[PDB]
Each structure stands twice: as C-alpha cells, then as structure tokens.
C-alpha cells in the first residue's frame, strides 16, 4: 500500500508518512497494525536508516518515531561505530548531546517525554562505552558543571550515571571483552570521587523529590561496586536511615539502598564501623515504627488490601530485615540496650511471615532457617529468642503445605524440626491445643485438619521415644474420636486419611508396637475395599510407605504369631486386592517384594516369591497355553490388557527385589520372549492390512504396551542383577534374537524406542562381556535409527534421545564395536555425533558433545597406530570446525562449556604432538611443517571466511591466545567469550586477547 513509501530511500524521507506508519502500529489494530509493523521493521533494519535518524529527531513530532530512530542509532553505535568516518562519530555524539540538553531545558518536554529522554540517555551511554574516557576525558567534569545550572539537567545526569554504572558493572560480563570491561570499570572508579560529591550534595541540600529519587536510584547502582568508605566515612547513612525513610517518595528506593549497604564489604574488627552498622538499623526501624506502622500492626491484612505500593514495601522490608539480620544480628545480641531493637526487628518479621504470599513466605522462611539453625548450635543464644520462636512454631504449623509444593514442605519441616529441638514441650503443647480446636469445632475444616496433620507428621524423630509414644497416642486417640464424631463419608474420609498419614510418619512407634502395627495394616486392607474417591490410593500409598520403613517386622515371626506376617498377607492377597485398580494392585505387589527381599535365607525368599506370584503366574500359564494355540486371541483387547497387567505385576515386584527377582524371571522368560515375537508379528500384520494409522488404534497400542512392558521388565532386572554370568549366558542371546531383527525390519513408525533403552542397559551392565553382541546391536539399530532422525530435529523425539544414550555407552564400554565398523559406517558415526552438536534439545546435545570427547580420548588411547592416524587425517578438522560452528552461531549457548572443553582437548592434541602424522596433504605446505603451524593456518583461514569483517590481526591474536591457553579451561573460556563479543561488532581491539597475560 501507501505506507511502504518510507522504505524507498532514493526519495527524501516523508516524516509525516513515518509518523502515520508509527501511529498505525502503536495506536491502531488488526490488519493495519500488522502491516505497519512489518514496514517499521524493514525500515529500522535498513543498514542506511541511521543516516536518516538526525532528520527524524529534528523534525518528527511523534515521540515513538524518535524512539525508533534512537534504536536504529543504537544498532549502529553498538555494532559498526568504529567503521564510520571519524566525522560521523563526532557528528552523532554532538547530535545526541544537543538533543538531550534541549529536551531538559523545555520543562514541558522534560515532564511529558520521560520515555524518549530515557532512551536518549541510554544511547548517550552507548557512545560513552565506545568513546569515554580516552576520546572524551572531560565528560564527567562537564557533567558535574552542567548539573549546577539546572535542576532538570542535574536530574537527567543522575539517570545517565545510573545507566552508565549499570552498563559498566552490572551488565558488562557477557556484552564486553574482559579487557574493555576492566578499562571502563577502572575509568568510572578513577572519577567516582567527583561523582559521589555531586550525589551527596544533592542528597544533603536538594528539595526536588524527583531529583532526590533519581539520585538515590543511581546510588543503588553504585552500592554494587563502590568502596565501603564512601558509605561509612560520610554522613550518608544518617540521611538514608532518617530523612529519606520519612517521605514515601524516597522510602522505597532508600530501603533498597540500605539493603545493599547491608551487603557491603566491611572490616569486621572495627568498633566504629560496628556502631555505625547498628545505628543505621536502629534509625530505620524507628522510622518504620513512627512513620509507617507499629510492630503490632496486622501486616497480613495490610498486604491483602494491596493499597498503593504497600505490597512492594512489605516485600522490601522483609528483604531488608532478613538481609541485615542474617549478617549482623550478633551485633545486637550482647548489648542489653540493643535487645529491644533486636526483638522488634524480629517481631516485624513474625508479622511479615503471616502474609498470604507464597514467594514472600519463602523469603522469610529462609531467614528463619538461618536463625534456628544458629540457635541449635551456637552457645547461649536460644534464650534470647524464646518468645519469637514460640510465635514461629504457630506460624509454621498453621501454614504447613502438602508434603506428598515439595520444596516448601521440606524447608518448613527443617525449620520446625529445629524449633522442636529448641523447645520440645512448647511444640507439643501448640499441636495438642490445635487439635482440641479441631474437636471443639472452632477451627474445624478439611483444610485445617490436613495442615495440622502434616505438621504433626513433620517433626517425627525429634522427640524422645517415651515422649513420642504418649504424644502419638494422644494424637491418634484425639483423631479417632474426631472421626467418630463426624458424619458422612466426606468428613470421615478426610479424618481417617490424616490418621493414616500420621501413623505412616512415625515408623519408630510402629516398630515398637507390633499389635498396633498389625491393626493399622489390617485397617488399610479394609480401606482397599472402600470405593469413596481417594481412599484406596491413600490405603495403598500408606501400605508401601509403612513397609519401606518397617519391612523387617513383616518378615520375622513376631512373638505370639504363628508365622511371619508376610505369609498372612500373601495368603489373602486375592481378597485384599479384589476391588483395587490394576495400578494399585501393582503397588501392593511391589510392597510385598520389599518385604520378601528382607528374607535372606534363599529357599524361604524364593518360596515367598513364588507364592506371591501365584495368581499372575497362573493367569500367565493359562494365556500362554491359550494364546499360543490361537494367536487370534491377542486381538481381544481383554486378553491384551490381562497380559499387560501380568507383566506390569512382574515389573513392580522386580523393581523392589532386583537381583532377588531372578527365579521368577526364569519362570516366564522363554515364553515371554515368544510372546514378544507373536505380538510383534501381529503389529506388523495390522500395519500391513490397515496402514500406518494402525499404530494409533487401541488394538495396536495395547499390543505395543506388551512389548514395552516386556522390555522394561528385562531392563529393570538387568540393571540390578548381581550374577552377570547368568545375564550373559542365559538372558542376552534370547533377548537379542527376539528384539533386534524385529526392530530393524519394522517400518519407522512401528519401532519401539524402548528397544534402544533396553539395549543401553544391556551394554552398560555386561557390554564388556559380549563384544559380538554389541556389534550385533549396532548393525541392527544404528543406520536405520539414524535415518529416522537425520532429516530434521523434531521427528521421533524418543528415538533421538535413546539413540545417543546407546551410542554413548557403546563408546564408553565397547569402543571396539566402532573399530569393526566398515569405513562408510564409521563416517556415519562421525556425522551422527556432529548432528547431535546441532540440536538445541539438551538431552541430545550434551550426549553428542560427550561422545565426541570420549571418542577423541579413545582414539588417543590407541597410541600411534594406523586407525588412529587415519582418524585424525579424516576427522580432526571436521570436529574442530563443527565445534567452532556451534560455539559461534548464537543458537547453541546452552552447550558452551562442553563445546569449549572439546575444543580445548582438540587443540591440546596438536600442541602436545599427540598426533603422529601430518594433518595436511602432500604438497599443501612445505615438508616438515609442524601440525601446530598448519592448525593455526587452517583456523586463521576458517575464521577469515566465516567472519570476513574481522581483521587478520584480530584472528591471529585470538588464535595465539586460545592456543597458549589450551591447558587452562577457565581462561580458554574467557578468550572464547571475548571472541564471541568481537564477532558481533566491527573493529574489536586485538590486544583484548592479551587480557589473561
């Protein structure tokens, strides 16, 4: 349309056309807006658009247009400044300075266009980063001078200085070379005395709130880096902690300044400093008490009301109090005259800890952890805080979150455990009283009984066994009566669940009271027939949890019993689990396997195992007899689900028994692999008859579940096996014969990535014992899986991940399998590794970089032999250049550290002459040229063509440094990051690469 006229640079820029495009983008909508956006982007991305910025800034009446003009200038200053003719550099500086002065002088502009002025200030700062001080030594003196002649200019100079400090000290690490960052830090540090003088004069004398606030905002930045003497040898702490805490305009920024002050580097042997540190805290707390709110105030309610900036203020007060007290509270702990201050500060924190705000609670909770840990270890401190700790007990107990929010529960548990050790009597009393108000109904609610139950469970192990015993009794007695008293399964379910939760948290109590433990389990078994939502899950979860902690008491014969209780559980398992869902049945069997593995008499353990598996083994025999006599059954979804659940039961028990599971595995192994084959050909037949869409059908998904569960069973056992001779001689060969060809000869959409995962475990555990088997694995999965994943980075995501895990372990444990590869296949292996480099997916990328590193090491270990020499001739520079590519292309930042490690190993091979042949071709350099010289030459040429805007000097200095530093990973990395900065601009200083030296 018409709007595209600004894109035609052969004409003069119609400024009114620019403003129309900008208005349509910012204030317009829909299709119009979108067109304008695409035009504006094309405009500012024109490499000549900066030439028209001085027009826009002079003659536009639209502040958005000028903002975009400054963005265009920013790109130029940041990337191409040093390529400009020097006259344009001076011209751009002068234009930007003048524009800022003029905007400051017009009070209407100064108040109405803060966004445009802030952008101009930032553009100025970009110029300073290029020009100052070496080409602009007077900037700071003239800034200080101009500040005195105008409040607006002075205020704006505080913004400029704030941004300069941010750009030099807070955001330089990843955007400048090490040398340039140091140069600017030293330059600011050299002239900060004069800057501070202006800043302190403004704070002492000024009356313009807006100027004061800007000065304090810049002070906040300075506190990140300035020497402590500017804070402690001036009166600035007094001003911060009194004058500026009184007006709310300055209060927010001042508090943030004082928080950073609480983090300055200060000598800890100076008594004057210590009193100053006490004093500014005392002043601040006094101002809060008299100007904001007293310590008794309900901060929970204030925060909830969310008036004005109250929420940010209370957040900032929490940060101030916790930061200062974590560092300095010892200063307040010995002087009786500071005791009130110490406790008032902590009382504010108590009140802050009642606010309903998860992230703020975590901030205060981290501090409480710091406090109560110190009271637990440090002599003569806990009595000071007795009343604070008592209140904290109630706060934590009442805000306990669900354990089974994982991180927050663990932090709360930790604090409460400390608080229990500090005063066990007070903790018990609070919890009992709390339980009474659940019974009297005054604080009764589903939520409230739950949180109290979690709190009670969380302190298990802190009381003596005698005190624990009558505490647990009291709690359960009260909880039982509470459940009696309520009506409806809703309430009774909630309370019975909490009872089982508490019980499960006190295994020490269960192990000492067998009859009670028996009653619990039998009650859980009862609850496994209760269909009210949640009860059965709760029952099974509590069962396995109690078992994990008390298994020994199920496997011995307890006095007054006829048999170990595990026998009684097994005898009645059919009725016990009759009403459970399969997933819950498997948990039950897993719990039984935990117990059975505690039996170390082998004949008894194996009898228990075969008895436990009686029902699945009989179902199994039946289906094996049937399904073998009629493969059609396997299309009956009912038979498929039965089969899968049998195998899942075996997985569950094998999970808890590991090596002990072997006898049960032997009962089913050979027929299970025959079932694998029968299901496999059923899947293939369906895909033949119906197409690829068959893999989505329930029938085939069910069949593949069987295959996956069989593989998971074998993986689970082999990962835990202790007799590896049996693994190799009995399990592996039937396994490979059953799974490898089926995988290779299925179409891609029918191959189970789980095959790769299972093979990864085989190689891990016994790879060293089956070299021919590893070769067979590679032959059957390597090329066909690679072809699935080497066309994009997205298809077959699970095969992708498992593929590189398998290659990684093969490269670790049976590298000889890659040696036997025919040369065309070894080349595919190298391509596969580099392909992995180029993934953004961390799973693949990390393994790809590690395989590369491990491979180099494997080759190095071979010594000076033909395969190793051919490897370097064929692939050394491929690995060097592919590593450099992902290091420098800005799309693989997540792998920087491992790319650098790989690159460093590669370069060090050459500079230790661990490569025994020339890396160059016959007549490419004189006879006798060292690989060192050739490597430098190859890299110089590579970087020159890849980054043509670098000077030869830049490249040569970078490579000289990188080469010298190839034993020092930290420094090597610094030099790589310096190179990544320099390739983003023109004219980088080649002496930057001498920084480490």
């Amino acid at each position: 349309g018409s709007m595209e006229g600004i894109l035609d640079f052969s004409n003069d820029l119609d400024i009114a056309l620019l403003d129309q495009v900008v208005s349509t983008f910012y204030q317009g909508s829909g299709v119009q807006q979108k067109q304008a956006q695409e035009i504006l982007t094309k405009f500012q991305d024109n490499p000549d658009a900066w030439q028209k910025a001085d027009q826009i800034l002079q003659f536009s009446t639209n502040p958005q247009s000028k903002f975009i003009a400054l963005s265009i200038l920013d790109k130029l200053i940041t990337r191409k400044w040093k390529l400009l003719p020097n006259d344009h550099r001076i011209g751009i500086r002068n234009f930007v300075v003048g524009m800022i002065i003029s905007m400051c002088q017009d009070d209407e502009v100064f108040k109405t266009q803060k966004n445009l002025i802030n952008k101009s200030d930032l553009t100025l700062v970009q110029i300073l980063k290029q020009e100052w001080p070496q080409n602009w030594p007077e900037f700071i003196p003239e800034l200080i001078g101009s500040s005195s002649s105008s409040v607006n200019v002075c205020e704006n100079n505080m913004i400029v200085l704030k941004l300069l400090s941010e750009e030099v000290f807070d955001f330089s690490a990843e955007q400048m070379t090490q040398a340039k960052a140091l140069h600017l830090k030293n330059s600011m540090s050299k002239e900060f005395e004069q800057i501070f003088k202006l800043c302190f004069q403004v704070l002492e004398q000024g009356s313009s709130s807006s100027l004061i606030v800007a000065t304090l905002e810049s002070l906040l930045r300075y506190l990140h880096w300035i020497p402590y003497r500017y804070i402690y040898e001036t009166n600035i702490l007094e001003l911060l902690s009194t004058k500026f805490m009184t007006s709310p305009d300055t209060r927010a920024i001042t508090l943030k300044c004082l928080t950073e002050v609480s983090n300055l580097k200060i000598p800890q042997d100076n008594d004057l400093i210590k009193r100053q540190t006490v004093l500014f805290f005392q002043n601040t707390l006094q101002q809060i008490a008299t100007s904001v709110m007293p310590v008794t105030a309900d901060l929970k309610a204030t925060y909830a009301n969310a008036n004005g900036n109250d929420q940010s203020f209370l957040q900032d007060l929490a940060m101030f109090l916790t930061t200062y007290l974590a560092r300095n509270r010892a200063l307040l702990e010995s002087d009786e005259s500071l005791r009130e201050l110490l406790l008032n500060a902590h009382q504010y924190l108590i009140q802050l800890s009642k606010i309903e705000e998860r992230e703020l609670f975590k901030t205060t909770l981290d501090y409480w952890h710091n406090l109560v840990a110190d009271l637990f270890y440090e002599p003569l401190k806990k009595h000071i805080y007795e009343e604070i700790c008592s209140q904290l007990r109630l706060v934590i107990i009442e805000n306990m979150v669900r354990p089974e929010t994982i991180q927050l529960y663990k932090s709360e548990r930790e604090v409460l455990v400390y608080l229990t050790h500090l005063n066990v009597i007070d903790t018990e009393e609070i919890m009992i009283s709390k339980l009474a108000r659940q019974i009297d109904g005054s604080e009764w609610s589903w939520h409230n009984i739950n949180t109290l139950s979690w709190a009670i469970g969380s302190i298990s192990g802190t009381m003596s066994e005698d005190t624990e015993k009558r505490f647990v009794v009291t709690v359960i007695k009260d909880l039982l009566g509470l459940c009696e008293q309520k009506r409806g399964k809703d309430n009774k379910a909630v309370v019975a669940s909490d009872i089982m939760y508490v019980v499960g948290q006190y295994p020490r109590f269960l192990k000492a009271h067998w009859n009670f433990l028996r009653t619990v389990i039998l009650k859980l078994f009862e609850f496994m027939h209760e269909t009210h939502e949640g009860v059965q899950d709760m029952a099974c979860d509590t069962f396995i949890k109690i078992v994990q902690k008390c298994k020994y008491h199920f496997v011995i014969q307890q006095p007054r019993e006829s048999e170990p209780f595990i026998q009684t559980i097994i005898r009645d398992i059919q009725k016990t689990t009759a009403d459970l869902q399969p997933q819950q049945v498997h948990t039950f069997y897993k719990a039984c396997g935990i117990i059975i593995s505690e039996e170390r008499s082998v004949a008894e353990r194996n009898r228990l195992l075969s008895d436990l598996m009686q029902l699945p083994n009989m179902a199994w025999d039946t289906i094996v007899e049937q399904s073998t006599a009629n493969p059609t059954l396997l299309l009956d979804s009912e038979t498929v689900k039965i089969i899968a659940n049998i195998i899942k039961t075996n997985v569950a028990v094998c999970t808890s028994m590991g090596a002990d599971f072997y006898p049960q595995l032997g009962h089913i192994y050979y027929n299970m692999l025959q079932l694998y084959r029968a299901v496999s050909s059923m899947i293939s037949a369906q895909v033949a008859a119906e197409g690829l869409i068959a893999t989505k059908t329930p029938k085939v998904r069910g069949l593949r579940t069987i295959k996956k569960e069989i593989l998971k069973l074998v993986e689970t056992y082999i990962s835990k096996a202790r007799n590896l001779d049996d693994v190799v001689k009995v399990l592996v060969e039937p396994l490979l014969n059953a799974v490898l060809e089926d995988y290779m000869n299925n179409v891609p959409d029918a191959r189970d990535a789980e095959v790769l995962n299972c093979m990864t475990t085989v190689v891990e555990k016994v790879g060293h014992m089956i070299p021919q088997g590893v070769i067979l694995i590679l032959q059957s999965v390597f090329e066909c899986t690679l072809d699935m994943i080497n066309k994009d980075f997205t298809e077959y995501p699970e095969h992708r991940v498992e593929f590189y895990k398998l290659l990684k372990v093969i490269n670790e444990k049976s590298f000889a399998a890659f040696l036997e590869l025919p040369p065309a296949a070894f080349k595919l292996f190298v391509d596969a590794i580099c392909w992995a480099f180029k993934h953004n997916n961390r799973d693949v990328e990390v393994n790809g970089l590690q395989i590369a590193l491990d491979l180099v090491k494997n080759i190095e270990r071979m010594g000076n032999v033909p395969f190793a020499n051919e490897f370097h001739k064929n692939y050394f520079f491929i690995f060097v250049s592919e590593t450099f590519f992902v290091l420098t292309d800005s799309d693989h930042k997540s792998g920087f550290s491992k790319q650098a490690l790989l690159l460093m190993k590669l370069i060090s091979l050459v500079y230790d002459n661990k490569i025994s042949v020339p890396l160059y071709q016959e007549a490419e350099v004189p006879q006798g040229t060292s690989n060192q010289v050739y490597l430098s030459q190859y890299l110089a040429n590579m970087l020159s063509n890849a980054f043509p805007h670098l000077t030869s000097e830049q490249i040569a200095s970078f490579l000289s440094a990188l080469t010298k530093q190839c034993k020092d990973l930290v420094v090597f990395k610094g030099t790589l990051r310096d190179f990544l900065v320099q390739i983003k601009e023109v004219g980088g200083d080649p002496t930057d690469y001498l920084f480490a030296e």
Binding site: K469, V473, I476, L480, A496, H513, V520, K523, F527, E530
Partner: peptide
C-alpha cells in the same frame, strides 16, 4: 497403646 481402638475406625 492397645487402649487405642483403631480397629473401630470406620468410613
């Protein structure tokens, strides 16, 4: 402990 009548717990 045996005084606790947990076997009576009902839903």
């Amino acid at each position: 402990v045996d005084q606790l009548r947990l076997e009576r717990l009902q839903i």
